Design a protein around this motif. Sequence first.
Motif, PDB file in Angstrom:
ATOM      1  N   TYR A   1       4.817 104.471  79.314  1.00 50.40           N
ATOM      2  CA  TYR A   1       4.775 105.376  77.904  1.00 50.40           C
ATOM      3  C   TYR A   1       3.027 105.741  77.538  1.00 50.40           C
ATOM      4  CZ  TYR A   1       6.143 107.506  73.682  1.00 50.40           C
ATOM      5  OH  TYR A   1       6.411 108.199  72.606  1.00 50.40           O
ATOM      6  N   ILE A   2       2.793 106.623  76.766  1.00 53.28           N
ATOM      7  CA  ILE A   2       1.527 106.580  76.069  1.00 53.28           C
ATOM      8  C   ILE A   2       0.864 105.536  75.305  1.00 53.28           C
ATOM      9  CG2 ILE A   2       1.236 109.211  76.343  1.00 53.28           C
ATOM     10  CD1 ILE A   2       2.386 109.537  73.322  1.00 53.28           C
ATOM     11  N   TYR A   3      -0.020 105.206  75.494  1.00 57.45           N
ATOM     12  CA  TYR A   3      -0.789 104.286  74.597  1.00 57.45           C
ATOM     13  C   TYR A   3      -0.962 104.883  73.367  1.00 57.45           C
ATOM     14  CZ  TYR A   3      -1.854 102.158  79.245  1.00 57.45           C
ATOM     15  OH  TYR A   3      -1.848 101.519  80.522  1.00 57.45           O
ATOM     16  N   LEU A   4      -1.396 106.221  73.315  1.00 55.71           N
ATOM     17  CA  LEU A   4      -1.875 106.700  72.011  1.00 55.71           C
ATOM     18  C   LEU A   4      -0.490 106.743  70.857  1.00 55.71           C
ATOM     19  CD1 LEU A   4      -3.631 109.990  71.209  1.00 55.71           C
ATOM     20  CD2 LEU A   4      -1.032 110.107  70.574  1.00 55.71           C
ATOM     21  N   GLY A   5       0.821 106.924  71.407  1.00 57.31           N
ATOM     22  CA  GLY A   5       2.028 106.755  70.469  1.00 57.31           C
ATOM     23  C   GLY A   5       2.238 105.604  70.174  1.00 57.31           C
ATOM     24  N   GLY A   6       1.849 104.264  70.870  1.00 59.15           N
ATOM     25  CA  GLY A   6       1.863 102.864  70.540  1.00 59.15           C
ATOM     26  C   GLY A   6       0.945 102.612  69.384  1.00 59.15           C
ATOM     27  N   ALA A   7      -0.462 103.070  69.610  1.00 54.69           N
ATOM     28  CA  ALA A   7      -1.673 102.939  68.802  1.00 54.69           C
ATOM     29  C   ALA A   7      -1.305 103.575  67.474  1.00 54.69           C
ATOM     30  CB  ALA A   7      -2.615 103.484  69.652  1.00 54.69           C
ATOM     31  N   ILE A   8      -0.836 104.622  67.398  1.00 52.62           N
ATOM     32  CA  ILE A   8      -0.665 105.328  66.023  1.00 52.62           C
ATOM     33  C   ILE A   8       0.412 104.735  65.382  1.00 52.62           C
ATOM     34  CG2 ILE A   8       0.255 107.561  65.001  1.00 52.62           C
ATOM     35  CD1 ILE A   8      -1.107 109.066  67.289  1.00 52.62           C
ATOM     36  N   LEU A   9       1.559 104.389  65.961  1.00 55.36           N
ATOM     37  CA  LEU A   9       2.696 103.385  65.507  1.00 55.36           C
ATOM     38  C   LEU A   9       1.964 102.226  64.776  1.00 55.36           C
ATOM     39  CD1 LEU A   9       5.514 103.130  64.762  1.00 55.36           C
ATOM     40  CD2 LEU A   9       6.057 102.565  67.164  1.00 55.36           C
ATOM     41  N   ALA A  10       1.392 101.455  65.785  1.00 56.16           N
ATOM     42  CA  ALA A  10       0.558  99.880  65.449  1.00 56.16           C
ATOM     43  C   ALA A  10      -0.277 100.195  64.226  1.00 56.16           C
ATOM     44  CB  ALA A  10      -0.044  99.614  66.713  1.00 56.16           C
ATOM     45  N   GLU A  11      -0.975 101.464  64.018  1.00 61.68           N
ATOM     46  CA  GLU A  11      -1.909 101.578  62.849  1.00 61.68           C
ATOM     47  C   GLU A  11      -0.864 101.903  61.747  1.00 61.68           C
ATOM     48  OE1 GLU A  11      -5.005 104.542  62.378  1.00 61.68           O
ATOM     49  OE2 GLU A  11      -5.662 103.321  60.598  1.00 61.68           O
ATOM     50  N   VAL A  12       0.117 102.490  61.821  1.00 61.38           N
ATOM     51  CA  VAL A  12       1.213 102.669  60.760  1.00 61.38           C
ATOM     52  C   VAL A  12       1.690 101.589  60.028  1.00 61.38           C
ATOM     53  CG1 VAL A  12       3.055 104.024  60.183  1.00 61.38           C
ATOM     54  CG2 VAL A  12       1.182 105.275  60.946  1.00 61.38           C
ATOM     55  N   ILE A  13       2.343 100.531  61.035  1.00 56.99           N
ATOM     56  CA  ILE A  13       3.134  99.319  60.895  1.00 56.99           C
ATOM     57  C   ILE A  13       1.997  98.190  60.396  1.00 56.99           C
ATOM     58  CG2 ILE A  13       4.245  97.205  61.940  1.00 56.99           C
ATOM     59  CD1 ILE A  13       5.868 100.177  61.422  1.00 56.99           C
ATOM     60  N   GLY A  14       0.764  98.122  61.035  1.00 54.19           N
ATOM     61  CA  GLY A  14      -0.264  97.258  60.547  1.00 54.19           C
ATOM     62  C   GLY A  14      -0.798  97.624  59.236  1.00 54.19           C
ATOM     63  N   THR A  15      -1.176  98.851  58.774  1.00 50.74           N
ATOM     64  CA  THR A  15      -1.673  99.166  57.587  1.00 50.74           C
ATOM     65  C   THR A  15      -0.641  99.358  56.536  1.00 50.74           C
ATOM     66  OG1 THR A  15      -1.616 101.521  57.928  1.00 50.74           O
ATOM     67  CG2 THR A  15      -3.540 100.706  58.223  1.00 50.74           C
ATOM     68  N   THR A  16       0.520  99.676  56.890  1.00 52.88           N
ATOM     69  CA  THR A  16       1.923  99.166  55.962  1.00 52.88           C
ATOM     70  C   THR A  16       2.045  97.629  55.617  1.00 52.88           C
ATOM     71  OG1 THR A  16       3.055 101.026  56.603  1.00 52.88           O
ATOM     72  CG2 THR A  16       4.297  99.439  55.566  1.00 52.88           C
ATOM     73  N   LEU A  17       1.666  96.780  56.533  1.00 52.41           N
ATOM     74  CA  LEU A  17       1.935  95.331  56.257  1.00 52.41           C
ATOM     75  C   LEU A  17       0.891  94.745  55.518  1.00 52.41           C
ATOM     76  CD1 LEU A  17       3.169  94.305  59.926  1.00 52.41           C
ATOM     77  CD2 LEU A  17       4.502  94.042  57.758  1.00 52.41           C
ATOM     78  N   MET A  18      -0.447  95.699  55.452  1.00 58.38           N
ATOM     79  CA  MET A  18      -1.400  95.135  54.544  1.00 58.38           C
ATOM     80  C   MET A  18      -1.268  95.053  52.861  1.00 58.38           C
ATOM     81  SD  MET A  18      -5.142  96.971  56.335  1.00 58.38           S
ATOM     82  CE  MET A  18      -4.864  96.706  58.123  1.00 58.38           C
ATOM     83  N   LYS A  19      -0.532  96.065  52.427  1.00 57.53           N
ATOM     84  CA  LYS A  19      -0.147  95.995  50.916  1.00 57.53           C
ATOM     85  C   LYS A  19       1.253  95.607  50.715  1.00 57.53           C
ATOM     86  CE  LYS A  19       2.251 100.242  51.463  1.00 57.53           C
ATOM     87  NZ  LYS A  19       2.097 101.094  50.142  1.00 57.53           N
ATOM     88  N   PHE A  20       2.095  95.191  51.734  1.00 56.29           N
ATOM     89  CA  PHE A  20       3.381  94.900  51.423  1.00 56.29           C
ATOM     90  C   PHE A  20       3.598  93.597  51.302  1.00 56.29           C
ATOM     91  CE2 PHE A  20       7.910  95.022  51.960  1.00 56.29           C
ATOM     92  CZ  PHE A  20       8.454  94.652  53.302  1.00 56.29           C
ATOM     93  N   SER A  21       4.660  93.005  50.380  1.00 59.43           N
ATOM     94  CA  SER A  21       5.360  91.837  50.320  1.00 59.43           C
ATOM     95  C   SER A  21       4.549  90.818  49.526  1.00 59.43           C
ATOM     96  CB  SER A  21       6.150  91.461  51.548  1.00 59.43           C
ATOM     97  OG  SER A  21       7.291  90.245  51.394  1.00 59.43           O
ATOM     98  N   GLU A  22       4.710  90.477  48.262  1.00 67.91           N
ATOM     99  CA  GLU A  22       4.231  89.299  47.644  1.00 67.91           C
ATOM    100  C   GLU A  22       4.990  87.981  47.977  1.00 67.91           C
ATOM    101  OE1 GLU A  22       3.219  92.057  43.625  1.00 67.91           O
ATOM    102  OE2 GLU A  22       2.935  89.657  43.376  1.00 67.91           O
ATOM    103  N   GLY A  23       6.130  88.148  48.282  1.00 67.40           N
ATOM    104  CA  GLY A  23       6.917  87.065  48.732  1.00 67.40           C
ATOM    105  C   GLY A  23       6.880  87.164  50.549  1.00 67.40           C
ATOM    106  N   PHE A  24       7.347  86.160  51.388  1.00 66.63           N
ATOM    107  CA  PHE A  24       6.930  86.320  52.804  1.00 66.63           C
ATOM    108  C   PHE A  24       7.920  87.238  53.560  1.00 66.63           C
ATOM    109  CE2 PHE A  24       3.391  83.775  53.874  1.00 66.63           C
ATOM    110  CZ  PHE A  24       3.280  82.955  52.597  1.00 66.63           C
ATOM    111  N   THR A  25       7.728  87.950  54.435  1.00 67.30           N
ATOM    112  CA  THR A  25       8.509  89.108  55.039  1.00 67.30           C
ATOM    113  C   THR A  25       9.662  88.563  55.667  1.00 67.30           C
ATOM    114  OG1 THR A  25       6.607  88.964  56.897  1.00 67.30           O
ATOM    115  CG2 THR A  25       6.715  90.782  55.269  1.00 67.30           C
ATOM    116  N   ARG A  26      10.825  89.018  55.364  1.00 66.05           N
ATOM    117  CA  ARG A  26      12.085  89.082  56.342  1.00 66.05           C
ATOM    118  C   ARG A  26      11.815  89.471  57.784  1.00 66.05           C
ATOM    119  NH1 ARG A  26      18.190  92.370  55.078  1.00 66.05           N
ATOM    120  NH2 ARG A  26      18.287  92.181  57.155  1.00 66.05           N
ATOM    121  N   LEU A  27      12.642  88.783  58.713  1.00 64.92           N
ATOM    122  CA  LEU A  27      12.491  89.154  60.106  1.00 64.92           C
ATOM    123  C   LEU A  27      11.266  88.670  60.845  1.00 64.92           C
ATOM    124  CD1 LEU A  27      11.546  91.655  62.478  1.00 64.92           C
ATOM    125  CD2 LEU A  27      13.525  90.242  62.844  1.00 64.92           C
ATOM    126  N   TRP A  28      10.032  88.958  60.308  1.00 68.07           N
ATOM    127  CA  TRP A  28       8.757  88.985  60.813  1.00 68.07           C
ATOM    128  C   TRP A  28       8.082  87.752  60.201  1.00 68.07           C
ATOM    129  CZ3 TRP A  28       6.873  92.147  64.361  1.00 68.07           C
ATOM    130  CH2 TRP A  28       5.282  92.438  64.291  1.00 68.07           C
TER     131      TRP A  28
END
Lengths: 102, 102
Positions: A1-28
């Motif tokens: 599969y495309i690296y680019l689609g993984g890379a954009i998705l990885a930035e979206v998840i990674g940046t979202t995880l920067m400001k998210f959750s004052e408690g410790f994340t469910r699942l992860w």
Amino acid sequence: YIYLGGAILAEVIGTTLMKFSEGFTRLWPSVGTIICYCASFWLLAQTLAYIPTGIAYAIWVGVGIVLISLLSWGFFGQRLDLPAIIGMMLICAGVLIINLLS
Amino acid sequence: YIYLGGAILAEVIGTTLMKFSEGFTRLWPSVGTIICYCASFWLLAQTLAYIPTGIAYAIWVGVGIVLISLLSWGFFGQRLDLPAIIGMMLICAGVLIINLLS
Ligand SMILES: Fc1ccc([P+](c2ccc(F)cc2)(c2ccc(F)cc2)c2ccc(F)cc2)cc1
């Protein structure tokens, strides 16, 4: 599969995880976020091995903003009729015009 | 907040180091470039506490285009045709609309 689609998705998840959750994340485990940062750089390096940087940047900005807007409405419930969305769209239209004349 | 302005400078330092490493020096570690990009992300993470992620992506690209354009030609606003003038105005106006919003 495309690296680019993984890379954009990885930035979206990674940046979202920067400001998210004052408690410790469910699942992860929090070391998963560190692995995700490492994965994002690995995916980016594969992406800009094969795709020209300026051409990629135009795809990347356009896909990334839409993807995180869809995610912002979907997972975080954010409104689509906020005046900030209109302000963002004016910037998105303006950056596209400069990209075509450069 | 002026953190995104700092993130833009951290991007300028890191991008120049990457371009410098590819084109000119043979002796620069990848990890240092990665840390300079990570500094842009840390300054972004401080920004993401105040500015939503979708809005933050659009501003980062537009603020980037004006600073990168000025540095890469060595002056701002030479060789502008009519749609380029509109493009610059749209970017400034959209950021101003976000700036006036709380
Ligand atoms: F909204 C944005 C803002 C910035 C970027 P960025 C970037 C940011 C952080 C990082 F760790 C590595 C690379 C980029 C550019 C084309 C791509 F395919 C992928 C990434 C980038 C680097 C150098 C430059 F001159 C301009 C942008 C992408 C979307």
